Amino acid sequence: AAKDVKFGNDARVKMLRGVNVLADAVKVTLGPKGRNVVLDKSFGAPTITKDGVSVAREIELEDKFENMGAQMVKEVASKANDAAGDGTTTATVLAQAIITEGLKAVAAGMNPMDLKRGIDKAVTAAVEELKALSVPCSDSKAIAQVGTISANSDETVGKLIAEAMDKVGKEGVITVEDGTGLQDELDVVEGMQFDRGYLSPYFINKPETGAVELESPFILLADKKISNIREMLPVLEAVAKAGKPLLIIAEDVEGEALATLVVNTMRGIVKVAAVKAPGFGDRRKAMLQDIATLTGGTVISEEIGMELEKATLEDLGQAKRVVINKDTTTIIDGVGEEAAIQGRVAQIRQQIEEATSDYDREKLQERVAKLAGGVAVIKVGAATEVEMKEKKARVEDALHATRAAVEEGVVAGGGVALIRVASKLADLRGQNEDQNVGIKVALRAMEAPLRQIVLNCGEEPSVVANTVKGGDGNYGYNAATEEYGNMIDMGILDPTKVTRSALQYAASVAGLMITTECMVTDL
Amino acid sequence: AAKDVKFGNDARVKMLRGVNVLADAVKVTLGPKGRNVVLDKSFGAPTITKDGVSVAREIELEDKFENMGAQMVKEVASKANDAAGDGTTTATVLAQAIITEGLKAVAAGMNPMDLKRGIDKAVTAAVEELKALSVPCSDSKAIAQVGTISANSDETVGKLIAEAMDKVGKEGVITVEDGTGLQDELDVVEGMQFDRGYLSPYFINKPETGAVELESPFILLADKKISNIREMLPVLEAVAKAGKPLLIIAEDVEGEALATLVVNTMRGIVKVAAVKAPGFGDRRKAMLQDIATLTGGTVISEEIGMELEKATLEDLGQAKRVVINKDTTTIIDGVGEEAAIQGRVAQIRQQIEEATSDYDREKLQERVAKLAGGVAVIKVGAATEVEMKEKKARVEDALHATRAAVEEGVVAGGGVALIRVASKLADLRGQNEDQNVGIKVALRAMEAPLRQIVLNCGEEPSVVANTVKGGDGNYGYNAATEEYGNMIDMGILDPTKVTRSALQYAASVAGLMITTECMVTDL
Amino acid sequence: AAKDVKFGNDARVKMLRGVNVLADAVKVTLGPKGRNVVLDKSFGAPTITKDGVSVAREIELEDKFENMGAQMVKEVASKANDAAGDGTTTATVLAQAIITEGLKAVAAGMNPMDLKRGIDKAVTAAVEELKALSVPCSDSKAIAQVGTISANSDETVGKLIAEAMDKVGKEGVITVEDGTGLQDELDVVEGMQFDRGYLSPYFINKPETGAVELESPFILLADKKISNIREMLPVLEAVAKAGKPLLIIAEDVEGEALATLVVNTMRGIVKVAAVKAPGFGDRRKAMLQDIATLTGGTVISEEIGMELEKATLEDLGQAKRVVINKDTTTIIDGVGEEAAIQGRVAQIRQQIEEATSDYDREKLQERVAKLAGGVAVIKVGAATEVEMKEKKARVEDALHATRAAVEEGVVAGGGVALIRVASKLADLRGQNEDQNVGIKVALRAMEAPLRQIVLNCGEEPSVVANTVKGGDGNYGYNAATEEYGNMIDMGILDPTKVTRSALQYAASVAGLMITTECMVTDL
Numbered sequence A, B, C: 001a002a003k004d005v006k007f008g009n010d011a012r013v014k015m016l017r018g019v020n021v022l023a024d025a026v027k028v029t030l031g032p033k034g035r036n037v038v039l040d041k042s043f044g045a046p047t048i049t050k051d052g053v054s055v056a057r058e059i060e061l062e063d064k065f066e067n068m069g070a071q072m073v074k075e076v077a078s079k080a081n082d083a084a085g086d087g088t089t090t091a092t093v094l095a096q097a098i099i100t101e102g103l104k105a106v107a108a109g110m111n112p113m114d115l116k117r118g119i120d121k122a123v124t125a126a127v128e129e130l131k132a133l134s135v136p137c138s139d140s141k142a143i144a145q146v147g148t149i150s151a152n153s154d155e156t157v158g159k160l161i162a163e164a165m166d167k168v169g170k171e172g173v174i175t176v177e178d179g180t181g182l183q184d185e186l187d188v189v190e191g192m193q194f195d196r197g198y199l200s201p202y203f204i205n206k207p208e209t210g211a212v213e214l215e216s217p218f219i220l221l222a223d224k225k226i227s228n229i230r231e232m233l234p235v236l237e238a239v240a241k242a243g244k245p246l247l248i249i250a251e252d253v254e255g256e257a258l259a260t261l262v263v264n265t266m267r268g269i270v271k272v273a274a275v276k277a278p279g280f281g282d283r284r285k286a287m288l289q290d291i292a293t294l295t296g297g298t299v300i301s302e303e304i305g306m307e308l309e310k311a312t313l314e315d316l317g318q319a320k321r322v323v324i325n326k327d328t329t330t331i332i333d334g335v336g337e338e339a340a341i342q343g344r345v346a347q348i349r350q351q352i353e354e355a356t357s358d359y360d361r362e363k364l365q366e367r368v369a370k371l372a373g374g375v376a377v378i379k380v381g382a383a384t385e386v387e388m389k390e391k392k393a394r395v396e397d398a399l400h401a402t403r404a405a406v407e408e409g410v411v412a413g414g415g416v417a418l419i420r421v422a423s424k425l426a427d428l429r430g431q432n433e434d435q436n437v438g439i440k441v442a443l444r445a446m447e448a449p450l451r452q453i454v455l456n457c458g459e460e461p462s463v464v465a466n467t468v469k470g471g472d473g474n475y476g477y478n479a480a481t482e483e484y485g486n487m488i489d490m491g492i493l494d495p496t497k498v499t500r501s502a503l504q505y506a507a508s509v510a511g512l513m514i515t516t517e518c519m520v521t522d523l
């Protein structure tokens, strides 16, 4: 339609106003003294959340240019959540700081593309320095502390994540689920996990988490590809009568003749989903057989000659809970048979003892790790649904933070790591003066997380920032106890991946936004 | 769409205004001198109710932030009703008191997260002190008094509930249904009850009670699920000939080829429902056989070879009334042969006389308890429909309260138990000063139920609260007779579960609500 | 008419909003890095001013409660201007800080009357500590530095004021008036000054400074008070034909038959003013004789028999410029006769050498000091009228500040003195806790001038405030050079009277305002 076109400082201040609205709503949640945000939901009760990305996703403005800025900066929280699942508030705070300082430099007549280049150079240097001063979470062994910090100083959540990592392994699969009591529970049970996603965007359930849940579902397995509808239509009727939702693990499924027909068949009463099969050839068949044995099902094949028309409900597999996400799909609890599971584990161990191929060896080691470790389910204890959603979000944040910590390491929390890397980059220079000003903009924005943490505590951010900058190493400000000390010793640890990702995404988006002179939107 | 975003005290006062609107409407109903609320119904006559959750569910505000506050608080009454079925007004009163005091503390600069932690610590301590203060309802033997208090001092309702618990046992199943006369009736008849729910969210009938009623229905039983629904299609038409609702008890039934098709088939004249069967394997088959014998029906099986195509209406089961709820589904009066029921009971008793396995022992004991106890139906007597709805709500409250009393115990009513536990927690302290303020907020809110009860009587709540606090034990204030005395002696008994649940849910929601600094809603 | 009535926090936030509007407009002008405010004038060009009281007087809000707050704080700048003629921005900043912190304490449930009592106790203690901390400007001898600081670091203005004080004495009268060139001129000329005001409030000219000006005026002197109007009507006609404005000096004149008649006679072409004469009886006659000899005029008396009807234009006195103010009326330049002036001075000196009465001695010494010192005139040099008004305001501020400095002493500038006295009052306590919180409010608000000075420089106020508080003595922050050092050594000196008065007026008004629970205005 007809477009409103704005130029220069008018467009820039409107975009900054939108960025500020989103970033203020998100930044009120930063740190231990960060507060909560109520998001009105079109379905049911409002959501109370301390998660930056949840607040960011819900922000949309009446003013179109302000909304444009809000959406562009909301991309920062979205990317931070997608990458690290944590630090979305920090990423938003950093993006707002870079935007504000860069727009100030633009108003000083400097070339915004050179400012963007300086910001990018500073952020590359800072990512290198973050890697340099990162400390492995195996050496530090503070997975509980990382989980506690990421769960808003909830020591019980961090202890639970630490116990789950001690039980199913630091790389084992852990899933956060809604509990039934008022207490958080940890249950290590038998399950399977494969890194595959749903093949239909309309499969998403009523919750907007992006992943679908199947309660006591029906597992279907097939290594070959079927053509005719009427061949497996009686199987569709049998599934429709089993009472348990259908999850199909096949090589690949379209939506032209299967998803469209079923979506025109239902109004949404039963959630039927299909997933891809990791690997190919012999590996796909062997993983399918393992999944069938875990769930008590069977896998059809051309060589076997078994047809789906003769398949019964008892022949097919059954589970208790399945979580299907784009990144990773996990069958949480498949009944199957414990003796069968143990026998399959022993058989795969014997196969390891037999085979010698390097790729086969590593895939068999992955298989035995998946089977022996099982899954660990953390049931969130909460008296109400709003408390359940809040605590589950915090536990998922702690889970993501602990995974990122054991993957990439830890650094001093409370914004201290960014302060230290900015201090180490004081002598960084660019090609020209505008690049140097962009570098200074990035370095000053690197203090914004600590300053916002301190602002949320009601203290004076400049004094605390100066005291931290005057220190060295992991010296910083415990905002919970409102006192200075060694951040590592006090247990305030941030995953290096979370900090690095927040900085990188904030920098990319914000540096792009400071280079804008014109904005085109609808009237 | 575009979002209105509010921050700090403006958001908090709008949230509190919504909370106050909902809580005032709910709280006018508290205590013996509490009054009624008329809720306008889009269908039929308005509903007159003294039930806090009924008033709460009907509250929705034009202002969006006030509406958010109202919805969050309405969650308290919803959770209290779901858990204890009583005390929703007390839960709302407690939530409003916690929110008001906690928002006052937040306005005093206190960190709301620490206030929430202090509130949670105080509420955990008070739950412990309520458990300690609780007295078993078997020892006290005041089920009639509990039912009388929960029925708004209706001694006839309490006496009826006491007689029903004396006849079918304290754990026997009791259903409240509309009568035909102007007097309340108690009828102990043969029936069955299994803890299973409906498999379709659209199965809810015209009444919004959440449980569906089938009048003189037709019972269908099956332990195995056939593939295609066209096989029983003749049985479906045979059912469609006889105007009896079809309740199908099976292992599990989906809805994407049976419920969706039946929804597209009929417009809702006569209803058909499907439910799960308790147990699995042999236990499920035994339960289905028992239900069929109670209702005079038959159970199909693969081993038997009896196909549904040969099934007739006479072979299938039949009942007089069935109430299907998510928590528990009960067949009130299955139309079956009395001699057959007695013979089945004798055969089962012989099975106890033969069986010895501990799990089999307990399941057989449950079977004989369910069969011998039967069901007790309370026919609510009322001249008009509005009086019927009001009295039925009160009798359901009394039933829930008596169940909670025989389950978890009783305490002094009139808010005296919360006053006593708050007095016992005067020396409770948290980690810091804000946590201590949160504890004091929780303790002061624990007085709110008694104060609101006294306000509804027109007396001065502070004087009565001080007089009660100056006493000890079960000393409190009979608001019906407007005089002080031992609450247990005067029969003002509250179930411990009801009090504890009201406190826990009010605390969870209100503590989360005082921690909000930003609110995002539609414009 | 009909009244809008607001209560509690709604009234308080409206009042605070008005206070904030006025104080923000005023506070943008504080310190060496303070900027200017453009005030729209209904007559002619807008005025550009760095004066806090000029901005404050021009502020009036559409909202009535915000306007009430604005008027109440505008009283602070008005009182500071009336008392010290300087520090009105500091007084406004202090008042805003006291109001903000005190309203925060009121929102914390604290008694505002006790907060006001604590504020008053802290401010009394701080006035005492300022008196102790003050250093005489005779010992320091930094009148040039005081004038430079008060003229917004205009060293030329401070040097000019210092030269004028060296010439006509520190107590000699100095008048700032518009020049004709682009350079500031200092002219020590013969004149007189008596601490008397105009007898009519309608005499105020179009300029709003409150002091009327007569260009080349005609001086009339009289000691005896005649009754009728026709007696001096020939004198009035002689003045009307003379062409020079009339300034009458007498005992006392009403306005029933003279001011009203002269107001109705003309429309405002040439102004005619009447003023009191210093002293009484013989002293009044001697003062009138001295003034007449200075201006070349004559004084009528009953004993002399010289009637006003016989007075001629040559007999009456004449001057070149007259400025009349309520506080003090000064005849700037009267022609008279130099030989007559010298003869009168010698005669009065001989009278001193003759008489011996202590009161006569002191009055004669005052007379000879006034005659010998004469007057100093500072001609403000500016190319345009807007620059003229701005520079004249700054020179008048410097003049007032130098007078206050030689009267009451100096302290460290840049808000350092208030910081030091707040540090000294750290252990001050009141009767109760609310009084102690009021004391803390006053002590925190006494940091506001330095913090606003630093904010106007674009630096971080908390860091500079902490650095200054960590220092001792006159150590502070030169905001012009942006570096720390001894405030006295760098010549940043504030008159002790200016600082003390700003604190006292801010405290009185702000403490009264924090005690308000209801506001009544027009709708």
Ligand SMILES: Nc1ncnc2c1ncn2[C@@H]1O[C@H](COP(=O)(O)OP(=O)(O)OP(=O)(O)O)[C@@H](O)[C@H]1O
Residues within 6 Å of the ligand: A029, A030, A031, A032, A034, A050, A051, A052, A053, A085, A086, A087, A088, A089, A090, A091, A149, A150, A152, A153, A397, A412, A413, A414, A415, A449, A453, A477, A478, A479, A480, A481, A492, A493, A494
């Ligand atoms: N006690 C503490 N003292 C100081 N800083 C702390 C403390 N606890 C946590 N932090 C810091 O607060 C930040 C985490 O706050 P928060 O979890 O609200 O934001 P986030 O991780 O950036 O985003 P998200 O909302 O996506 O989780 C990290 O920088 C962490 O190191």
Ligand SMILES: Nc1ncnc2c1ncn2[C@@H]1O[C@H](COP(=O)(O)OP(=O)(O)OP(=O)(O)O)[C@@H](O)[C@H]1O
Residues within 6 Å of the ligand: B029, B030, B031, B032, B034, B050, B051, B052, B053, B085, B086, B087, B088, B089, B090, B091, B149, B150, B152, B153, B397, B412, B413, B414, B415, B449, B453, B477, B478, B479, B480, B481, B492, B493, B494
């Ligand atoms: N005669 C009485 N004297 C004093 N308190 C009484 C008396 N009768 C009942 N109460 C008290 O009144 C409260 C019950 O009020 P009411 O039943 O209206 O609300 P509720 O139990 O909170 O919730 P709901 O609306 O769901 O029933 C309990 O605290 C009970 O102990």
Ligand SMILES: Nc1ncnc2c1ncn2[C@@H]1O[C@H](COP(=O)(O)OP(=O)(O)OP(=O)(O)O)[C@@H](O)[C@H]1O
Residues within 6 Å of the ligand: C029, C030, C031, C032, C034, C050, C051, C052, C053, C085, C086, C087, C088, C089, C090, C091, C149, C150, C152, C153, C397, C412, C413, C414, C415, C449, C453, C477, C478, C479, C480, C481, C492, C493, C494
């Ligand atoms: N170079 C300087 N460094 C630090 N502080 C300074 C400097 N020059 C002046 N100041 C301080 O700035 C303040 C004067 O500011 P300003 O004159 O604008 O306001 P004011 O005196 O409060 O009122 P008004 O507007 O009526 O003159 C004093 O506290 C003075 O000591």
Ligand SMILES: [K+]
Residues within 6 Å of the ligand: A029, A030, A031, A034, A050, A051, A052, A089
């Ligand atoms: K956050």
Ligand SMILES: [K+]
Residues within 6 Å of the ligand: B029, B030, B031, B034, B050, B051, B052, B089
């Ligand atoms: K009620």
Ligand SMILES: [K+]
Residues within 6 Å of the ligand: C029, C030, C031, C034, C050, C051, C052, C089
């Ligand atoms: K000023």
Ligand SMILES: [Mg+2]
Residues within 6 Å of the ligand: A086, A087, A149, A150, A397
């Ligand atoms: Mg986090």
Ligand SMILES: [Mg+2]
Residues within 6 Å of the ligand: B086, B087, B088, B149, B150, B397
């Ligand atoms: Mg009740």
Ligand SMILES: [Mg+2]
Residues within 6 Å of the ligand: C086, C087, C149, C150, C397
């Ligand atoms: Mg000044």
